[PDB]
């Protein structure tokens, strides 16, 4: 109505007293005044976020009621590309879509649209095509192949098609099967990529940059110039004006790390990510999705798959004196039991690093080096917040005096990514 869309990253909620408050998720603050005080304590709830997001998604009435597609299962990717990118009005895709498979053969997954989304997600997110490549830490999470242009001549068009399909999945309530690294979702949100975010992108770059961050680079005799092995011929690039003859020292460290990350990761995938976002936003402006975090954005796109805590517990190995009968371990599992399904998935993302659970269960759970199981290691003083390592699926759980303290600390850590 006359009020208009809320500013990006804002939400409106109804209090039990009936007065409506406004929550800024970027700063995590509640207020009474309309954006266009204490109010209620901030509570990041994915269910209410999703309800608000779906409510503010409005289907145009001018478009045809039904969006009809005919595809061949042998190569679903190609006909899907042709049909979806042949549409000049993206709003037509906002209309309900019924994908009549060839000869109505079947193979449904509870819905022909869901079956189409499943098979297409299998096809697009296969690194064989070259658009995407498996993450460094995991073997199932994906990322944009920086060399995607070399393999595919029209990689930008295919990335736009993938973005359009993802936008369709989010808009229509269906779910995609591909899980991306955290920097992927951060680049959707327009957030800043940090050194930790490189853990998924490349192990060599992350390890070298971490060494530089912690130790004095003066031993390495580093300049503000990096060598671009990619592209024909090997040549040096200055990260800052007069990069050569400028030496990386303790005062020039974080600037060097930021510039190296920008040149070697962000600059390389920026074009492909921009094409993906251009395809994605044709059905959902970024402002609506900016309320979600990267973790919540992953859940919104790939869905909230219920996690069986019994299988999770049985196929878990404890470390540093923790035992299944240990009071802290069973208290932690009690806290996991009482916590919601979305909170359980957020705990998975906090420790494992992704919401994907292997189809065989938690026995096949992987890691940076290889097959690695969920680990809960004793570490730190009781007061400290739990920490997580997603390269080895490790939760550094301090020994907690009582169940209530452990529950509160674990919830605070899970909520604060």
């Amino acid at each position: 109505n006359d009020l208009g869309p809320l500013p990006p990253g804002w939400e409106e909620r109804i209090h039990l007293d009936g007065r409506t408050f406004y929550i800024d998720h970027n700063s995590k603050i509640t207020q009474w005044e309309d954006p266009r005080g204490p109010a209620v304590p901030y509570s990041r709830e994915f269910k209410q976020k999703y309800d608000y997001f779906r409510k503010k998604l409005k289907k145009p009435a001018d478009i045809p009621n039904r969006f009809e597609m005919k595809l061949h299962r042998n190569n679903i990717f190609e006909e899907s590309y042709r049909r979806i990118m042949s549409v000049k009005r993206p709003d037509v895709l906002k209309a309900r879509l019924w994908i009549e498979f060839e000869s109505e053969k079947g193979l449904d997954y509870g819905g022909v649209a869901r079956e189409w989304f499943f098979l297409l997600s299998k096809e697009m997110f296969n690194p064989y095509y070259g658009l995407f490549e498996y993450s460094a830490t995991d073997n199932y999470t994906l990322q944009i192949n920086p060399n995607s242009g070399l393999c595919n001549e029209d990689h930008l068009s295919y990335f736009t098609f993938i973005g359009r399909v993802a936008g369709l999945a989010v808009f229509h309530g269906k779910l995609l099967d591909g899980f991306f690294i955290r920097p992927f979702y951060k680049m959707m949100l327009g957030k800043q990529i940090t050194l930790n975010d490189m853990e998924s992108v490349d192990s060599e770059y992350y390890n070298s940059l971490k060494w530089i961050l912690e130790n004095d680079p003066t031993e390495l005799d580093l300049m503000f110039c990096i060598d671009e092995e990619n592209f024909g011929q090997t040549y040096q690039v200055d990260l800052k004006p007069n990069g050569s003859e400028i030496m990386v020292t303790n005062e020039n460290k974080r600037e060097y790390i930021d510039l190296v990350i920008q040149w070697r990761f962000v600059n390389r995938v920026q074009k492909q990510m921009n094409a993906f976002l251009e395809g994605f936003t044709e059905l959902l402006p970024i402002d609506l999705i900016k309320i979600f975090d990267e973790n919540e954005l992953e859940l919104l796109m790939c869905g909230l798959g219920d996690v069986d805590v019994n299988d999770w517990r049985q196929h878990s190995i404890y470390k540093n004196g923790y035992c299944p009968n240990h009071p802290v371990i069973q208290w932690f599992w009690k806290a996991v039991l009482l916590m919601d399904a979305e909170k359980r998935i957020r705990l998975l993302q906090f420790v494992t690093g992704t919401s994907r659970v292997p189809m065989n269960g938690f026995a096949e759970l992987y890691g940076s080096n290889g097959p690695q199981l969920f680990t809960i290691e004793q570490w730190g003083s009781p007061e400290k917040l739990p920490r997580a390592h997603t390269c080895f699926n490790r939760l550094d759980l301090p020994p907690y005096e009582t169940f209530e303290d452990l529950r509160e600390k674990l919830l605070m850590a899970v909520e604060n990514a």
Partner: nanobody, 122 residues
Framework: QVQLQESGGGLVQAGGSLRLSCAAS????????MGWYRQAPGKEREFVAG???????YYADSVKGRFTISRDNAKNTVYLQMNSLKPEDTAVYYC????????????????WGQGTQVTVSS
């Protein structure tokens, strides 16, 4: 090609404020780094401030706290404001830009300003 000209540079008492503006002309497609450099009498050029990408701003430890670097997109002009100015600040202030141009492989083109003598009186 891009050409830079720095103005706003004049002798000022120490503890005075100087703003240096880098007027940039030409096709500034995508600036990788907008920096202010300093050349003291008898010394090589040394980094003073940098805008780099987005809004991340990097300062030299000598000028950290005292100076502030900003960019105006409509004018594409960078302003370095120096406060608590000191004799060390007396050097000649250049303005450099790096434009990442993509022909075959993407490469960095560095364009340097003429410079303004900024001095401190005390």
């Amino acid at each position: 090609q891009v050409q830079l000209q720095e103005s706003g540079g004049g002798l000022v008492q120490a503890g005075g404020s100087l703003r240096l503006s880098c007027a940039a002309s030409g096709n500034i497609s995508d600036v990788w780094y907008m920096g202010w450099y300093r050349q003291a009498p008898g010394k090589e050029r040394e980094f003073v401030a940098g805008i780099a990408y987005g809004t991340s701003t990097y300062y030299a430890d000598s000028v950290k706290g005292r100076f502030t670097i900003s960019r105006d997109n409509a004018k594409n002009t960078v302003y370095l404001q120096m406060n608590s100015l000191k004799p060390e600040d007396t050097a000649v202030y250049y303005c450099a830009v790096i434009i990442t141009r993509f022909v075959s492989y993407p490469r960095q083109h560095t364009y340097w300003g003429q410079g303004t003598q900024v001095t401190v009186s005390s």
